[PDB]
């Protein structure tokens, strides 16, 4: 994983978006293309929309979802059985 010494991968674009949102102290739906960003608990009230190769999916953040990458919560593959 992203080892300790390096520090996490919290990409600058949505870092800047959330800096905007928490400097305004209001929280809105957000659209982003970055599965690869790991999570800080700063996002718990924030709301993100994330891409599935096809569309977006707005999703709300929570305490225990930290330490994860958002794509864990964006379903990539549909499978329905046979």
């Amino acid at each position: 994983p992203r080892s300790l010494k390096k520090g996490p991968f919290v990409d600058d674009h949505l870092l800047k978006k959330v800096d905007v949102q928490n400097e305004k102290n209001t929280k809105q739906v957000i659209k982003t293309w970055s599965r690869r960003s790991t999570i800080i608990p700063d996002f718990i009230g924030h709301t993100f929309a994330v891409h599935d190769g096809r569309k977006h999916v707005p999703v709300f953040v929570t305490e225990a979802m930290v330490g994860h990458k958002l794509g864990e919560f964006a379903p990539t593959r549909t499978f329905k059985g046979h």
């Binding site: 300790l4 520090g7 996490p8 305490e63």
Partner: peptide, 11 residues
């Protein structure tokens, strides 16, 4: 759950 300590280990 102990994420306050997760991000004391992670900084």
């Amino acid at each position: 759950g102990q994420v306050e300590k997760f991000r004391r280990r992670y900084g």
